[PDB]
């Protein structure tokens, strides 16, 4: 009469919920690992404003024809 354990079904349900949270963490973990290895845009990784990688050099003796795309 003094033994009041939880029901077997409740134990299984609770452990299944815990394992589901654990698998969610495993998936988020693998996800972040993949996303860190993907490559970012030039604006996000180098410069948001002035997002053109192409330089323009010096402007004193600007020679017609020096521009090359």
């Amino acid at each position: 009469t003094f033994f009041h354990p939880k029901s077997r079904e409740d134990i299984l349900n609770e452990e299944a919920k815990i394992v589901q949270a654990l698998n969610n963490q495993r998936e988020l973990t693998i996800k972040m690992h993949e996303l860190k290895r993907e490559e970012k845009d030039y604006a996000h990784s180098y410069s948001p404003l002035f997002s053109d990688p192409v330089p323009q050099g010096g402007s004193i003796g600007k020679a017609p024809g020096s521009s090359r795309e």
Partner: protein, 171 residues
């Protein structure tokens, strides 16, 4: 391009133009006559110079070989205007460029000869000297009277000719 360094020899190429390229006359005036005639050359040949430079830009690196044609056009326009000066206003042109030869090529030292040359060229060739980019408030320096900066010696022949023109009323 940088100037040459420790040891260099100048060398001359004896080949001719490839015969496919149309021949062109070359400008024969030297530094002082060229600097004297520069404003008129610009006023006359501005469209051709602009076209030449636009070709050189658009070629994007092959400018020398793709832009020969309007280069010939540019040189021809320049030779034409120099010939017109030699036919119509030779004496004043010589005054101006000899004065420049004497004054380290500074236009500030030849205002008197330049006034005569400018009047002659405007009347006989319909070319005007003008300095681009100034607002109406700003005054072209070559039109300014009583400048702060004056030549060491006013050129003798130019002074005589200027006083003569003031008498004749041409200037």
């Amino acid at each position: 391009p940088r100037e040459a360094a420790a040891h260099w020899v100048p060398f001359e190429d004896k080949a001719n133009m490839p015969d496919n390229v149309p021949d062109v006359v070359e400008v024969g005036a030297t530094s002082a006559p060229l600097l004297s005639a520069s404003y008129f050359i610009g006023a006359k040949c501005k469209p051709y110079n602009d076209d030449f430079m636009l070709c050189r830009e658009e070629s994007q690196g092959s400018g020398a070989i793709d832009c020969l044609k309007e280069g010939r056009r540019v040189t021809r326009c320049a030779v034409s205007v120099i010939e017109d000066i030699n036919k119509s206003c030779l004496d004043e042109f010589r005054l101006h460029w000899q004065c420049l030869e004497q004054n380290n090529h500074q236009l500030s030292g030849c205002r008197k000869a330049e006034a005569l040359l400018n009047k002659c060229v405007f009347t006989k060739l319909n070319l005007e000297k003008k300095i681009p980019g100034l607002r109406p408030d700003e005054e072209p320096v070559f039109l300014k009277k009583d400048p702060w900066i004056k030549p060491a010696v006013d050129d003798f022949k130019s002074v005589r000719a200027y006083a003569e023109a003031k008498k004749n009323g041409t200037l």
